[PDB]
Scaffold this active site. Sequence first.
Site, PDB file in Angstrom:
ATOM      1  N   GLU A 257       0.821  -1.198   0.000  1.00  0.00           N
ATOM      2  CA  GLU A 257       0.000   0.000   0.000  1.00  0.00           C
ATOM      3  C   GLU A 257       0.870   1.270   0.000  1.00  0.00           C
ATOM      4  O   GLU A 257       0.735   2.131   0.870  1.00  0.00           O
ATOM      5  CB  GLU A 257      -0.918  -0.030   1.220  1.00  0.00           C
ATOM      6  CG  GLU A 257      -1.689  -1.339   1.347  1.00  0.00           C
ATOM      7  CD  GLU A 257      -2.561  -1.391   2.581  1.00  0.00           C
ATOM      8  OE1 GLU A 257      -2.167  -0.814   3.615  1.00  0.00           O
ATOM      9  OE2 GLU A 257      -3.633  -2.025   2.529  1.00  0.00           O
ATOM     10  N   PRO A 258       1.771   1.403  -0.993  1.00  0.00           N
ATOM     11  CA  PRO A 258       2.640   2.577  -1.069  1.00  0.00           C
ATOM     12  C   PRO A 258       1.871   3.868  -1.347  1.00  0.00           C
ATOM     13  O   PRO A 258       0.941   3.896  -2.158  1.00  0.00           O
ATOM     14  CB  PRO A 258       3.586   2.221  -2.207  1.00  0.00           C
ATOM     15  CG  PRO A 258       2.684   1.491  -3.142  1.00  0.00           C
ATOM     16  CD  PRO A 258       1.927   0.565  -2.196  1.00  0.00           C
ATOM     17  N   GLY A 259       2.264   4.935  -0.663  1.00  0.00           N
ATOM     18  CA  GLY A 259       1.621   6.221  -0.855  1.00  0.00           C
ATOM     19  C   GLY A 259       2.652   7.288  -1.183  1.00  0.00           C
ATOM     20  O   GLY A 259       2.776   7.719  -2.331  1.00  0.00           O
ATOM     21  N   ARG A 260       3.398   7.698  -0.165  1.00  0.00           N
ATOM     22  CA  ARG A 260       4.433   8.717  -0.287  1.00  0.00           C
ATOM     23  C   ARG A 260       5.427   8.417  -1.408  1.00  0.00           C
ATOM     24  O   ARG A 260       5.636   9.241  -2.302  1.00  0.00           O
ATOM     25  CB  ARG A 260       5.186   8.836   1.040  1.00  0.00           C
ATOM     26  CG  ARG A 260       5.985  10.116   1.211  1.00  0.00           C
ATOM     27  CD  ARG A 260       6.947   9.985   2.386  1.00  0.00           C
ATOM     28  NE  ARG A 260       6.264   9.700   3.642  1.00  0.00           N
ATOM     29  CZ  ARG A 260       5.587  10.599   4.351  1.00  0.00           C
ATOM     30  NH1 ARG A 260       5.501  11.861   3.937  1.00  0.00           N
ATOM     31  NH2 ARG A 260       4.977  10.230   5.468  1.00  0.00           N
ATOM     32  N   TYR A 298       4.852  18.072  11.401  1.00  0.00           N
ATOM     33  CA  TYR A 298       5.862  17.058  11.690  1.00  0.00           C
ATOM     34  C   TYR A 298       7.287  17.581  11.776  1.00  0.00           C
ATOM     35  O   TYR A 298       8.221  16.792  11.908  1.00  0.00           O
ATOM     36  CB  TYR A 298       5.809  15.970  10.614  1.00  0.00           C
ATOM     37  CG  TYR A 298       4.405  15.535  10.271  1.00  0.00           C
ATOM     38  CD1 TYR A 298       3.679  14.708  11.126  1.00  0.00           C
ATOM     39  CD2 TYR A 298       3.792  15.975   9.103  1.00  0.00           C
ATOM     40  CE1 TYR A 298       2.376  14.327  10.825  1.00  0.00           C
ATOM     41  CE2 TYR A 298       2.488  15.604   8.790  1.00  0.00           C
ATOM     42  CZ  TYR A 298       1.786  14.779   9.656  1.00  0.00           C
ATOM     43  OH  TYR A 298       0.499  14.420   9.341  1.00  0.00           O
ATOM     44  N   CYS A 322      -0.648  34.349   9.652  1.00  0.00           N
ATOM     45  CA  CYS A 322      -0.413  34.965  10.955  1.00  0.00           C
ATOM     46  C   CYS A 322       0.251  34.177  12.086  1.00  0.00           C
ATOM     47  O   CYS A 322       0.380  34.698  13.191  1.00  0.00           O
ATOM     48  CB  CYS A 322      -1.748  35.519  11.458  1.00  0.00           C
ATOM     49  SG  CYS A 322      -3.100  34.306  11.367  1.00  0.00           S
ATOM     50  N   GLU A 323       0.683  32.950  11.822  1.00  0.00           N
ATOM     51  CA  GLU A 323       1.307  32.112  12.851  1.00  0.00           C
ATOM     52  C   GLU A 323       2.794  31.872  12.687  1.00  0.00           C
ATOM     53  O   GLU A 323       3.298  31.823  11.569  1.00  0.00           O
ATOM     54  CB  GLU A 323       0.641  30.754  12.882  1.00  0.00           C
ATOM     55  CG  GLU A 323      -0.421  30.624  13.893  1.00  0.00           C
ATOM     56  CD  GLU A 323      -1.194  29.359  13.689  1.00  0.00           C
ATOM     57  OE1 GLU A 323      -0.587  28.271  13.781  1.00  0.00           O
ATOM     58  OE2 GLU A 323      -2.404  29.464  13.424  1.00  0.00           O
ATOM     59  N   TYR A 351       0.920  14.050   0.882  1.00  0.00           N
ATOM     60  CA  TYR A 351       0.467  14.720   2.091  1.00  0.00           C
ATOM     61  C   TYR A 351       0.730  16.206   1.995  1.00  0.00           C
ATOM     62  O   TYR A 351       0.991  16.877   2.992  1.00  0.00           O
ATOM     63  CB  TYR A 351       1.164  14.114   3.310  1.00  0.00           C
ATOM     64  CG  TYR A 351       0.985  12.613   3.366  1.00  0.00           C
ATOM     65  CD1 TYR A 351      -0.275  12.052   3.580  1.00  0.00           C
ATOM     66  CD2 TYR A 351       2.059  11.750   3.136  1.00  0.00           C
ATOM     67  CE1 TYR A 351      -0.465  10.664   3.557  1.00  0.00           C
ATOM     68  CE2 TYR A 351       1.884  10.362   3.114  1.00  0.00           C
ATOM     69  CZ  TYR A 351       0.620   9.825   3.322  1.00  0.00           C
ATOM     70  OH  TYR A 351       0.431   8.462   3.285  1.00  0.00           O
TER      71      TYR A 351
HETATM   72  C1  LIG Z   1      -2.973   1.379   6.221  1.00  0.00           C
HETATM   73  C2  LIG Z   1      -2.012   2.256   5.520  1.00  0.00           C
HETATM   74  N1  LIG Z   1      -1.472   1.878   4.273  1.00  0.00           N
HETATM   75  C3  LIG Z   1      -0.563   2.698   3.589  1.00  0.00           C
HETATM   76  C4  LIG Z   1      -0.201   3.983   4.147  1.00  0.00           C
HETATM   77  C5  LIG Z   1       0.548   4.841   3.220  1.00  0.00           C
HETATM   78  O1  LIG Z   1       1.896   4.887   3.628  1.00  0.00           O
HETATM   79  P1  LIG Z   1       2.888   5.689   2.910  1.00  0.00           P
HETATM   80  O2  LIG Z   1       2.455   7.042   2.265  1.00  0.00           O
HETATM   81  O3  LIG Z   1       3.414   4.691   1.787  1.00  0.00           O
HETATM   82  O4  LIG Z   1       4.002   6.030   3.972  1.00  0.00           O
HETATM   83  C6  LIG Z   1      -0.722   4.361   5.393  1.00  0.00           C
HETATM   84  C7  LIG Z   1      -0.195   5.509   6.181  1.00  0.00           C
HETATM   85  N2  LIG Z   1      -0.909   6.284   6.895  1.00  0.00           N
HETATM   86  C8  LIG Z   1      -0.485   7.554   7.577  1.00  0.00           C
HETATM   87  C9  LIG Z   1       0.501   8.409   6.785  1.00  0.00           C
HETATM   88  C10 LIG Z   1       0.713   9.737   7.487  1.00  0.00           C
HETATM   89  C11 LIG Z   1       1.703  10.635   6.760  1.00  0.00           C
HETATM   90  C12 LIG Z   1       1.659  12.098   7.236  1.00  0.00           C
HETATM   91  N3  LIG Z   1       0.335  12.705   6.890  1.00  0.00           N
HETATM   92  C13 LIG Z   1       2.795  12.901   6.603  1.00  0.00           C
HETATM   93  O5  LIG Z   1       3.947  12.415   6.587  1.00  0.00           O
HETATM   94  O6  LIG Z   1       2.508  14.019   6.129  1.00  0.00           O
HETATM   95  C14 LIG Z   1      -1.619   3.539   6.074  1.00  0.00           C
HETATM   96  O7  LIG Z   1      -2.129   3.969   7.283  1.00  0.00           O
HETATM   97  C1  LIG Z   2      -2.172  40.448  14.559  1.00  0.00           C
HETATM   98  C2  LIG Z   2      -3.016  39.544  15.369  1.00  0.00           C
HETATM   99  N1  LIG Z   2      -4.121  40.047  16.088  1.00  0.00           N
HETATM  100  C3  LIG Z   2      -4.937  39.207  16.859  1.00  0.00           C
HETATM  101  C4  LIG Z   2      -4.674  37.784  16.886  1.00  0.00           C
HETATM  102  C5  LIG Z   2      -5.742  36.996  17.514  1.00  0.00           C
HETATM  103  O1  LIG Z   2      -5.302  36.557  18.778  1.00  0.00           O
HETATM  104  P1  LIG Z   2      -6.144  35.721  19.636  1.00  0.00           P
HETATM  105  O2  LIG Z   2      -7.099  34.673  18.984  1.00  0.00           O
HETATM  106  O3  LIG Z   2      -6.986  36.789  20.464  1.00  0.00           O
HETATM  107  O4  LIG Z   2      -5.144  34.915  20.552  1.00  0.00           O
HETATM  108  C6  LIG Z   2      -3.570  37.277  16.185  1.00  0.00           C
HETATM  109  C7  LIG Z   2      -3.045  35.898  16.381  1.00  0.00           C
HETATM  110  N2  LIG Z   2      -2.556  35.172  15.455  1.00  0.00           N
HETATM  111  C8  LIG Z   2      -2.167  33.723  15.534  1.00  0.00           C
HETATM  112  C9  LIG Z   2      -3.094  32.855  16.382  1.00  0.00           C
HETATM  113  C10 LIG Z   2      -2.706  31.395  16.241  1.00  0.00           C
HETATM  114  C11 LIG Z   2      -3.579  30.471  17.077  1.00  0.00           C
HETATM  115  C12 LIG Z   2      -3.452  28.990  16.678  1.00  0.00           C
HETATM  116  N3  LIG Z   2      -3.981  28.791  15.292  1.00  0.00           N
HETATM  117  C13 LIG Z   2      -4.206  28.103  17.668  1.00  0.00           C
HETATM  118  O5  LIG Z   2      -4.065  28.305  18.895  1.00  0.00           O
HETATM  119  O6  LIG Z   2      -4.935  27.209  17.193  1.00  0.00           O
HETATM  120  C14 LIG Z   2      -2.755  38.117  15.427  1.00  0.00           C
HETATM  121  O7  LIG Z   2      -1.698  37.567  14.729  1.00  0.00           O
END
Ligand SMILES: Cc1ncc(COP(=O)(O)O)c(C[NH2+]CCCC[C@H](N)C(=O)O)c1O
Ligand SMILES: Cc1ncc(COP(=O)(O)O)c(C[NH2+]CCCC[C@H](N)C(=O)O)c1O
Lengths: 394, 394
Positions: A257-260, A298, A322-323, A351
């Site tokens: 089941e290759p993906g990546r 990751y 904004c993050e 992905y």
């Molecule tokens: C059941 C099952 N089969 C195959 C895969 C695909 O694997 P791969 O892409 O060949 O490595 C999976 C994998 N599932 C999770 C992969 C998470 C990757 C993550 N979003 C990332 O690296 O960005 C599987 O579960």
């Molecule tokens: C410039 C600027 N003004 C206000 C905020 C909003 O702040 P808050 O929601 O009152 O804390 C921001 C914040 N920006 C980034 C927030 C990231 C949150 C993250 N996705 C999470 O906790 O899930 C701002 O940049």
Amino acid sequence: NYEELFQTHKTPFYLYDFDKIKQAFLNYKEAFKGRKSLICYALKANSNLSILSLLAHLESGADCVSIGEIQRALKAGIKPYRIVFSGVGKSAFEIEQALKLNILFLNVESFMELKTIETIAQSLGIKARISIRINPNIDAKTHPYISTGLKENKFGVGEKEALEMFLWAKKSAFLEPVSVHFHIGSQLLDLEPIIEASQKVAKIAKSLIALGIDLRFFDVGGGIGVSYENEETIKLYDYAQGILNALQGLDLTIICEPGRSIVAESGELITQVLYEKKNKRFVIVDAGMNDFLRPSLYHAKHAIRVITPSEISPCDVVGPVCESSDTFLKDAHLPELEPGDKIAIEKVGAYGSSMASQYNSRPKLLELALEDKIRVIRKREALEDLWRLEEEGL
Amino acid sequence: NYEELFQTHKTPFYLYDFDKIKQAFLNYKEAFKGRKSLICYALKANSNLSILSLLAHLESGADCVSIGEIQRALKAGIKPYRIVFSGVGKSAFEIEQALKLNILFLNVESFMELKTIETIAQSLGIKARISIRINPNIDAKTHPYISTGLKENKFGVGEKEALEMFLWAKKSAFLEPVSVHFHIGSQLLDLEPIIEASQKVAKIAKSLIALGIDLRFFDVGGGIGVSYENEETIKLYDYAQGILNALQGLDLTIICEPGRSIVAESGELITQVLYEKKNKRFVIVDAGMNDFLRPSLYHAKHAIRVITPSEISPCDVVGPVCESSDTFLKDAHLPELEPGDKIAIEKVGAYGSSMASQYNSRPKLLELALEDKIRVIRKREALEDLWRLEEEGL
Ligand SMILES: Cc1ncc(COP(=O)(O)O)c(C[NH2+]CCCC[C@H](N)C(=O)O)c1O
Ligand SMILES: Cc1ncc(COP(=O)(O)O)c(C[NH2+]CCCC[C@H](N)C(=O)O)c1O
């Protein structure tokens, strides 16, 4: 040919070299000639209709984790009998729909799922082909978020429980156990954990056949990592050799089941430079974490290559969101760039856009494919598509 | 009233208690009566058209980071003169569009952005109102991903550079510096870093006015954290008191850009139990990381409450997606539940559905609002909406 491209298409966008997808798939297909095998492309990596269609023309299979992925696969031309359905959380709707679509088998992750499938199969009057995923309790040696072979994880089940589940599916008139399966992790660079898993599961399988269970498939899942940071990759020749030796005495169709490893390299994120900012230097690009989640989720590092022919210094490549998590590469080294210069973030075919969101109200990107020929495989989202389903509530 | 609800709506979905949104906003609005102030709701937290409309009826402002958010705000009824536009990566298109929409001001993060805005303002023949974000180089003491006040981050600029940028906007006939701004982080539980930032910026501001810069606004951004894990929250009375003392001698309109503290609590993720799995216990629910990204992205822990009246033990609450990062709460403690039982993940109104994706080909959820009255504020996505823009390429 980047010039014609940048003239008719605005950044940022995903660009896929389809040949690399066709060649990567063909390598898995041939890595197993001395045996019957099925390569089920894991859609989660990239489910774009066009790429799935390309894989279908190569008679590829599909590893799906939702009715949505099964529908995509079928719509792209993949044969239902080459579709396998995994998932710890399949709903009754997904189970029922899958059984009616005659896919290869349902890979169950829990005993309660097995009983659920049975009840649904019974009402439809069919004998559901199922596979059982076992957790060989082995550390895949990867990132915790994509490591799934330890007992700590929610995937698969131990040997004892599996043995019981299998016997249960044998007795049932609505279940037909035909496969054993395992998947210990993703982006794996060490072939030992995979082999160790193959041996252990080959042992339980041999045991299963002695108990009357008529196995026809042996599924090793996916997990082979790519060279994001120029690391050495698990060769297919060694991978196949290992699994063949682990399967001594078991005449079963091997499934991968290759993906990546199928789509990663073929895809690239082309983004334009908007500003340069200065102790530290910041290279602000028009693509962001909403478009490419890997770095923040990751701590993944994908290579960054300048596409525009143009004093190399340290700089953080960042997007517009904004993050702080929104920076593609920390302390990268690039020549001084100016507004308009183009760069490509490498190996983002897996992905990449499949985990993309509209965070900060940014429409999903345009996806282009190269088939030697540049064509659109996903139109860019209009600003209005962001709130289309919120209009009536207003 | 959960029964009528579960009868006409399928899980999983977002449910918002609008009163809590109206009350949280009204608290910021009154926390500053002894002064002129503007509360600009940070859309990034939650940009749903319906909630923005509710805030608009309360004469709320809007802190936007993209043309998409500005368009949403305007469409929901927010006055353009109460809209502020931040962003380290605004594109020429976004700048131009914003200037033509007559918003309050553009909050620039780089000198190159300032020059870019000037060129565009000049071609449109207008004098662009701008604010400048300074990086007071102060640790907000939060999660690195949402901590933005350190010099290490890509947000804002140092004092020296800012002083220069301001003088530059003063001389220009197409720029009009009217505000100073700062935002040191998100989910802040300690009021000291905020106050320290206010004092430092109040000092530079006092300095700016002495140099001819006609400031009219003082923007403290957002950042006030909520009680995800029953922690003590920064009181508004202390927050306001602190900022007022930091502003001694500065007659300026204070601006706050609250996001999380406005919508977090009002939103909840209602999801149904699909299976229970067993050393460790796994409670498989139908919502996943694609719907709620906080746990995996920031290791955030949101409370989980059982909605269905029903032996409490340790268990990992997980979703259906194929990744290990897809578990809402590790070692949680809940009574034994069965297929069909409903639970709610708390305080998911901020950065919940706004960071949601379609990963694993799962359609975006249905969003419901309560106005005392249950109505849909975002229809659930159909399976076909997942690949609608990929059909022509097929
Ligand atoms: C059941 C099952 N089969 C195959 C895969 C695909 O694997 P791969 O892409 O060949 O490595 C999976 C994998 N599932 C999770 C992969 C998470 C990757 C993550 N979003 C990332 O690296 O960005 C599987 O579960
Ligand atoms: C410039 C600027 N003004 C206000 C905020 C909003 O702040 P808050 O929601 O009152 O804390 C921001 C914040 N920006 C980034 C927030 C990231 C949150 C993250 N996705 C999470 O906790 O899930 C701002 O940049």
